[PDB]
Protein backbone atom coordinates (compact mmCIF):
# COMPACT_ATOMS: atom_id res chain seq x y z
CA UNK A 1 0.00 0.00 0.00
CA UNK A 2 2.98 2.31 0.59
CA UNK A 3 5.11 3.70 -2.24
CA UNK A 4 8.04 6.06 -2.63
CA UNK A 5 7.97 8.92 -5.10
CA UNK A 6 10.01 8.49 -8.25
CA UNK A 7 13.29 10.38 -7.93
CA UNK A 8 12.39 12.75 -10.77
CA UNK A 9 9.10 13.54 -9.00
CA UNK A 10 11.09 14.32 -5.83
CA UNK A 11 13.11 16.90 -7.78
CA UNK A 12 10.05 18.35 -9.55
CA UNK A 13 8.36 18.88 -6.18
CA UNK A 14 11.29 20.90 -4.85
CA UNK A 15 11.53 23.00 -8.02
CA UNK A 16 7.82 23.84 -7.90
CA UNK A 17 8.04 24.77 -4.21
CA UNK A 18 11.11 26.98 -4.62
CA UNK A 19 9.57 28.70 -7.65
CA UNK A 20 6.22 29.45 -5.96
CA UNK A 21 7.72 29.98 -2.49
CA UNK A 22 6.93 33.72 -2.53
CA UNK A 23 3.42 33.38 -4.05
CA UNK A 24 1.94 30.40 -2.22
CA UNK A 25 -1.63 31.32 -3.22
CA UNK A 26 -0.86 29.95 -6.71
CA UNK A 27 -1.59 26.46 -5.36
CA UNK A 28 -5.32 27.18 -5.51
CA UNK A 29 -5.00 28.38 -9.12
CA UNK A 30 -3.45 25.05 -10.13
CA UNK A 31 -5.99 22.94 -8.23
CA UNK A 32 -8.72 24.83 -10.09
CA UNK A 33 -6.75 24.46 -13.33
CA UNK A 34 -6.42 20.72 -12.68
CA UNK A 35 -10.12 20.40 -11.80
CA UNK A 36 -11.00 22.05 -15.12
CA UNK A 37 -8.71 19.74 -17.11
CA UNK A 38 -10.41 16.74 -15.51
CA UNK A 39 -13.85 18.13 -16.39
CA UNK A 40 -12.61 19.06 -19.86
CA UNK A 41 -11.40 15.46 -20.13
CA UNK A 42 -14.69 13.76 -19.22
CA UNK A 43 -16.65 16.12 -21.49
CA UNK A 44 -14.61 14.98 -24.50
CA UNK A 45 -15.14 11.36 -23.42
CA UNK A 46 -18.88 12.01 -23.18
CA UNK A 47 -18.83 12.73 -26.93
CA UNK A 48 -17.97 9.04 -27.47
CA UNK A 49 -19.64 7.37 -24.45
CA UNK A 50 -23.35 7.96 -23.84
CA UNK A 51 -23.02 6.62 -20.27
CA UNK A 52 -19.80 8.41 -19.24
CA UNK A 53 -21.82 10.68 -16.91
CA UNK A 54 -24.11 7.95 -15.47
CA UNK A 55 -22.17 7.98 -12.17
CA UNK A 56 -22.73 11.72 -11.67
CA UNK A 57 -24.79 14.09 -13.80
CA UNK A 58 -23.24 17.38 -12.68
CA UNK A 59 -19.98 18.85 -13.99
CA UNK A 60 -18.94 21.10 -11.10
CA UNK A 61 -15.99 22.07 -8.92
CA UNK A 62 -16.93 22.59 -5.27
CA UNK A 63 -14.77 23.97 -2.46
CA UNK A 64 -15.35 23.55 1.28
CA UNK A 65 -13.55 25.04 4.28
CA UNK A 66 -13.42 23.28 7.68
CA UNK A 67 -11.85 25.64 10.21
CA UNK A 68 -12.80 23.28 13.05
CA UNK A 69 -10.93 20.37 11.42
CA UNK A 70 -8.30 22.45 9.54
CA UNK A 71 -9.17 21.09 6.09
CA UNK A 72 -9.62 22.54 2.61
CA UNK A 73 -11.53 20.53 0.01
CA UNK A 74 -11.38 20.94 -3.78
CA UNK A 75 -13.77 18.52 -5.49
CA UNK A 76 -14.36 18.12 -9.22
CA UNK A 77 -16.77 15.81 -11.06
CA UNK A 78 -14.23 15.17 -13.83
CA UNK A 79 -12.87 11.98 -15.36
CA UNK A 80 -11.40 10.82 -12.04
CA UNK A 81 -8.51 8.45 -11.41
CA UNK A 82 -8.30 4.68 -11.07
CA UNK A 83 -6.12 3.05 -8.43
CA UNK A 84 -3.36 2.60 -11.02
CA UNK A 85 -3.72 6.23 -12.12
CA UNK A 86 -3.42 7.45 -8.52
CA UNK A 87 -0.04 5.74 -8.20
CA UNK A 88 1.38 6.50 -11.65
CA UNK A 89 -0.02 9.96 -12.43
CA UNK A 90 0.98 11.26 -8.98
CA UNK A 91 4.04 9.15 -8.13
CA UNK A 92 5.89 9.12 -11.45
CA UNK A 93 6.31 11.04 -14.71
CA UNK A 94 4.44 9.80 -17.76
CA UNK A 95 3.32 12.86 -19.80
CA UNK A 96 5.66 14.62 -22.25
CA UNK A 97 11.34 19.76 -19.08
CA UNK A 98 13.55 19.38 -16.02
CA UNK A 99 16.38 21.10 -17.88
CA UNK A 100 14.00 23.91 -18.85
CA UNK A 101 12.93 24.44 -15.24
CA UNK A 102 16.59 24.39 -14.20
CA UNK A 103 17.57 26.71 -17.06
CA UNK A 104 14.83 29.20 -16.20
CA UNK A 105 15.67 28.88 -12.50
CA UNK A 106 19.45 28.99 -13.01
CA UNK A 107 19.21 31.87 -15.49
CA UNK A 108 16.74 33.45 -12.98
CA UNK A 109 13.63 33.53 -15.18
CA UNK A 110 10.07 33.23 -13.86
CA UNK A 111 8.37 29.82 -13.97
CA UNK A 112 4.88 30.34 -12.49
CA UNK A 113 3.28 30.15 -15.94
CA UNK A 114 5.68 27.29 -16.76
CA UNK A 115 4.23 24.97 -14.10
CA UNK A 116 0.61 25.79 -14.96
CA UNK A 117 1.48 25.23 -18.63
CA UNK A 118 2.67 21.63 -18.17
CA UNK A 119 -0.01 20.86 -15.58
CA UNK A 120 2.32 19.74 -12.78
CA UNK A 121 0.89 22.28 -10.30
CA UNK A 122 -0.70 19.58 -8.15
CA UNK A 123 2.45 19.43 -6.02
CA UNK A 124 2.27 23.15 -5.17
CA UNK A 125 -0.30 22.11 -2.53
CA UNK A 126 2.61 21.13 -0.26
CA UNK A 127 3.36 24.86 0.05
CA UNK A 128 0.40 25.19 2.44
CA UNK A 129 -0.48 21.58 3.31
CA UNK A 130 1.28 19.16 5.64
CA UNK A 131 -0.64 16.29 4.02
CA UNK A 132 -2.44 15.91 0.69
CA UNK A 133 -5.38 13.49 0.46
CA UNK A 134 -6.89 12.53 -2.83
CA UNK A 135 -10.21 10.77 -3.10
CA UNK A 136 -11.07 9.75 -6.65
CA UNK A 137 -13.46 7.46 -8.52
CA UNK A 138 -13.02 6.57 -12.20
CA UNK A 139 -15.81 5.03 -14.28
CA UNK A 140 -13.53 2.02 -14.91
CA UNK A 141 -12.51 1.36 -11.29
CA UNK A 142 -13.62 1.63 -7.67
CA UNK A 143 -13.19 4.68 -5.45
CA UNK A 144 -9.75 4.81 -3.79
CA UNK A 145 -7.89 7.12 -1.41
CA UNK A 146 -4.40 8.56 -1.98
CA UNK A 147 -2.38 10.02 0.90
CA UNK A 148 1.07 11.62 1.09
CA UNK A 149 3.13 14.03 3.19
CA UNK A 150 5.73 14.61 0.40
CA UNK A 151 7.95 11.88 1.94
CA UNK A 152 5.98 8.86 0.64
CA UNK A 153 2.48 8.06 -0.55
CA UNK A 154 -0.08 5.31 -0.03
CA UNK A 155 -3.21 4.12 -1.83
CA UNK A 156 -6.12 2.26 -0.20
CA UNK A 157 -9.59 1.32 -1.36
CA UNK A 158 -12.08 3.82 0.08
CA UNK A 159 -13.98 1.87 2.78
CA UNK A 160 -16.88 4.35 2.44
CA UNK A 161 -17.74 2.88 -0.96
CA UNK A 162 -18.77 4.92 -3.99
CA UNK A 163 -19.29 8.38 -2.47
CA UNK A 164 -18.24 10.74 -5.28
CA UNK A 165 -20.04 8.94 -8.13
CA UNK A 166 -17.33 10.30 -10.45
CA UNK A 167 -14.51 12.79 -9.99
CA UNK A 168 -11.78 13.69 -7.53
CA UNK A 169 -11.48 15.45 -4.17
CA UNK A 170 -8.20 17.13 -3.20
CA UNK A 171 -8.06 17.41 0.59
CA UNK A 172 -5.33 19.59 2.12
CA UNK A 173 -4.42 19.44 5.82
CA UNK A 174 -3.21 23.04 6.00
CA UNK A 175 -0.15 23.90 8.08
CA UNK A 176 -0.34 25.88 11.31
CA UNK A 177 0.92 28.96 9.43
CA UNK A 178 -1.66 28.50 6.64
CA UNK A 179 -4.84 28.92 8.71
CA UNK A 180 -5.34 32.21 6.82
CA UNK A 181 -6.87 30.12 4.02
CA UNK A 182 -9.46 28.75 6.46
CA UNK A 183 -11.35 32.06 6.50
CA UNK A 184 -14.14 32.44 3.96
CA UNK A 185 -13.49 35.97 2.66
CA UNK A 186 -9.94 35.00 1.66
CA UNK A 187 -10.94 31.79 -0.13
CA UNK A 188 -13.85 33.34 -2.03
CA UNK A 189 -11.54 36.12 -3.23
CA UNK A 190 -8.80 33.69 -4.28
CA UNK A 191 -11.30 31.40 -6.03
CA UNK A 192 -12.78 34.30 -8.00
CA UNK A 193 -9.33 35.45 -9.14
CA UNK A 194 -8.57 32.11 -10.82
CA UNK A 195 -11.95 30.61 -11.77
CA UNK A 196 -13.34 33.20 -14.21
CA UNK A 197 -11.96 31.49 -17.33
CA UNK A 198 -13.01 27.97 -16.29
CA UNK A 199 -15.77 26.71 -18.59
CA UNK A 200 -17.47 25.02 -15.60
CA UNK A 201 -19.30 26.32 -12.52
CA UNK A 202 -17.33 26.80 -9.30
CA UNK A 203 -19.16 26.65 -5.97
CA UNK A 204 -17.89 27.47 -2.47
CA UNK A 205 -19.62 26.25 0.69
CA UNK A 206 -20.11 29.56 2.51
CA UNK A 207 -22.19 30.79 5.44
CA UNK A 208 -24.29 33.84 6.24
CA UNK A 209 -27.01 31.65 10.17
CA UNK A 210 -27.37 29.10 7.37
CA UNK A 211 -24.90 27.49 4.97
CA UNK A 212 -25.06 26.83 1.22
CA UNK A 213 -23.06 27.03 -2.00
CA UNK A 214 -22.04 30.33 -3.58
CA UNK A 215 -21.21 30.67 -7.27
CA UNK A 216 -17.93 32.47 -7.96
CA UNK A 217 -17.47 32.52 -11.77
C1 LIG B 1 -3.98 15.38 -10.08
N1 LIG B 1 -4.32 15.02 -11.48
C2 LIG B 1 -3.33 14.84 -12.57
C3 LIG B 1 -5.71 14.80 -11.77
N2 LIG B 1 -6.04 13.78 -12.59
C4 LIG B 1 -7.37 13.61 -12.83
N3 LIG B 1 -8.44 14.30 -12.39
C5 LIG B 1 -8.07 15.32 -11.57
N4 LIG B 1 -8.93 16.23 -10.93
C6 LIG B 1 -8.11 17.04 -10.23
N5 LIG B 1 -6.76 16.73 -10.36
C7 LIG B 1 -6.70 15.62 -11.21
How many beta-strand segments? 9
Q: What is the beta-strand fraction?
A: 15-25%
| Amino- and carboxy-terminal Cα gap | 39 Å
Bound molecules: N,N-dimethyl-7H-purin-6-amine
Radius of gyration: 17 Å
H/E element order? EHHEEHHHEEEEHEE
Alpha plus pi helix count: 6
Biggest β-sheet strands, sense, barrel: 9 strands, mixed
Alpha-beta content class: alpha+beta
How would you characterize the overall build of this protein?
This protein is an alpha+beta fold and 217 residues long. It has one domain (1-217). It is built from 6 helices and 9 strands; from the N terminus they run E-H-H-E-E-H-H-H-E-E-E-E-H-E-E. A 9-stranded mixed beta sheet has the order 1-6-5-4-7-3-2-8-9, with helices on one face. The protein is globular. The modification N6-(2-hydroxyisobutyryl)lysine is found at residue 95. This is Endoplasmin. Glycans are attached at residues 34, 140. ATP binds at residues 34, 76, 89, 122. It is found in: Endoplasmic reticulum lumen; Sarcoplasmic reticulum lumen; Melanosome. It is classed as chaperone.
Amino acid sequence: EKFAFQAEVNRMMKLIINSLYKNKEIFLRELISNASDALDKIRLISLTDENALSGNEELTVKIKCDKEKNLLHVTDTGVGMTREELVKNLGTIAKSFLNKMTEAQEDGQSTSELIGQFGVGFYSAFLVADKVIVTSKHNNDTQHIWESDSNEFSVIADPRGNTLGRGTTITLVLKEEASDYLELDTIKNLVKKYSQFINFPIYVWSSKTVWDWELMN
